[model samples]
Target: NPELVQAVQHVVIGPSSLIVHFNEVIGRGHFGCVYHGTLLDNDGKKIHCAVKSLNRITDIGEVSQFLTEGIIMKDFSHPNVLSLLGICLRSEGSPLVVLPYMKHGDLRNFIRNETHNPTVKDLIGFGLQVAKGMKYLASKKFVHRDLAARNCMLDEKFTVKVADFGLARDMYDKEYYSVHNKTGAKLPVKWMALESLQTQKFTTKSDVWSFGVLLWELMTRGAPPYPDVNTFDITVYLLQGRRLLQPEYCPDPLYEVMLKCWHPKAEMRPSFSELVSRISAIFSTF
Candidate 1:
């Protein structure tokens, strides 16, 4: 079931040749294109990898952001985090980031296409894995502003690896604000906490809200939350004290965790340690 490879070939350089051509385009985003590729190592062994090529001219600031992403990935490493295999920089139009390929792809795709829907037990296990990754990020005092299901890659054994640090920032000395008019980027209404959406400030607590949305995605088999409501409508609905209702398929315990995460007061949101403990407790019951 391999689709046709979508890549440009035969581009030579002074020494190292661009040997790997994108075999399949798996995902796309505002940043660039992601394709599956096979890279040859020094021993002539083929290595499965993901190549992310940035959109050069989309935004002047994106180039700097892409470079920053490369710098960050090159320095960061954790067991539950995606590893950056290498990079292809050839005085070219855009640089490509090489990453280890996860056979099961991302969590979103797995939830959507798996033959059997993930049970609450499966979801709690997944949530614990996510918490483990978050705990690492918390140790570094880095806030992963975006922690959706799409950002988590799963291996053949269904182990989760947190990826995409482009939006990650050190929160050691930064104060969390709940207002966003100053930042300019539209708030992610569906995943953001009520305080974050209203004030545009993001904190570790705000990330908890996003984690809740990810849990919702997992329980609902990858369906987006508040699909019937637009971003603006969702924002207003939240402001009016309405929260996303748990889907019918979601278990009561999971719903309770989600509610704790979406607490209107940021201070009331559980810390990463608390989240880990709660999830571990849930698993004991299963």
Candidate 2:
């Protein structure tokens, strides 16, 4: 149903006008919580929406301290990227980000609940859509610091919807850097590129490495990557040239490309453009 998410409409309401409105807890971020609610659109009819209330404000020097996420997300309209309808601001902390809800929830959780084995096309479909979305983001110089199966969502058709502002599910809370393998936040250790883990540098190549991990998730139905390794061991593991072993039923070609994404030298890894081409060849009678 295209009506499942209608065209975006900006809603402007006073701070006190929107707070009593939020309902069920739908999702969360490093800075806030997302709740399912109905907010009156510019036309004044209640439109179902997901609202994210950030815990703090960052872009203080900007016109509206909390409008950054709303602005960032509003410009994106890709079917695979989640949409932001508008933003609701409080007199306090941060703006409440308004987005459309995904009924099937995040991709990893959806995969775990699957009762039937997905076909090879199904497995590749998720990766293809996600890579295509990321490729577009890369073209715009946007790096999704956290790209994982867990961050992707499913539409009614299970179409991949990259979640957040391309935003946060508890992001920005990223520990300024890892500390003796401990921090205020959980490291996406499994999905992180070796250099990102070591130097805190996040770029499109880093997102590519995470895509490789997502491919593993699609094959294993949400199994944790590097299931046997300790969290603290991840940095050392990848730095030492170790990569995730392919799970059962995965083809060698698919695994072959994943290993390329893990090459210790970031420059050696294939770009999303390269991965897009590489993905189609993996299942051609291999």
Candidate 3:
């Protein structure tokens, strides 16, 4: 736990003076609420930020667990990854994790609520950004236990960023299911890889599997993954070699990539690095 405390001190920890709009809740989850607040910078410039408040941490261990994510995020500096802006130290409760307020919000809702028509090229561009972010995580040997469109964010420029990290377990208030031995943890079963479903094992390849599902979301403009299959039957469905059918607009070649990601053997799935090149190559063709 000392490492966590030391990490907290070393990270960008700010005072309550940096926080504003405490009552405006933009997003809610199992941990707490995410407020759209303005963060006062070192030079007094007000920056829009997503203030993630963990209100349930009455115990020491819980706070450490929350800060651990901040520590992990502080080291990630990729353009496609959601960089941790800093942490705001609360006067009486657990500290708030500050992040850039992605103007377009998460990719899922962005696609579903599209007033701006996103073309096939735009979908490829978004998927490529996510692949780059996942490639960075793969390089760092960090396994993204949760990977879905809802977890991927979009900035004002329509740039995609991989966000939420390991927090998805509690961040999702819906579209999650519990497994036999996973106990109380809710999982994104539909996006999960076969190995993850059968053995609870996750690796970079598993993330690629999830990336495939996210790509499908982009192609379909945020259609629910596996809409025809029941949640509990996903493992069986996957085992039977059933995969998501390509959306009408998704190119035949792009659909091929999704199929590669869902290869029955985990080792057969493409690596995130390979996925980056593959997606980039596909983008070049368009």
Best by lDDT: 3
Model 3 score (lDDT):
0.81
Can you write out model 1's per-residue Cα lDDT over 49-121, one digit (the tens) per residue? 7777664334646655545543545445777777666656565466566777788877877788869577778
Candidate topping TM-score: 3
Look at candidate 3 and give me any clashing residue pairs.
Answer: none
User: Which is the winner by lDDT between candidate 1 and candidate 2?
Assistant: 2
Pull out the clashing pairs in model 1: 5-23, 177-201, 178-199, 178-200, 178-201, 179-199, 179-200, 179-201, 180-200
- Tens-place lDDT per residue, model 3, 1-286, is 7777677666555784466566888788777788888888778888898877777667878777766764776778888988877776766887777788999888888878858678899889999999999999889888887888898888888789998874322464465555533434677888888988888888888998999999999999989887788876888998898999989999999999999999999898899888989899999888
Poorest 10 consecutive residues of model 3 by lDDT?
Answer: 175-184
Q: How well does candidate 3 score on lDDT at residue 247? A: 97
Off by over 4 Å in 3: 166-169, 177-184
- The Cα local distance difference test for each model comes to 0.69, 0.71, 0.81
Cα lDDT of model 2 by residue, 96-203, tens digit = 666776777888777787574667667787888888788877887888877888888887777888774433445532422234443435667678888888887888
In model 1, state the lDDT of residue 253: 81
- What residue pairs are clashing in model 2? 29-170, 30-170, 164-167
What lDDT does candidate 2 reach at residue 264?
81
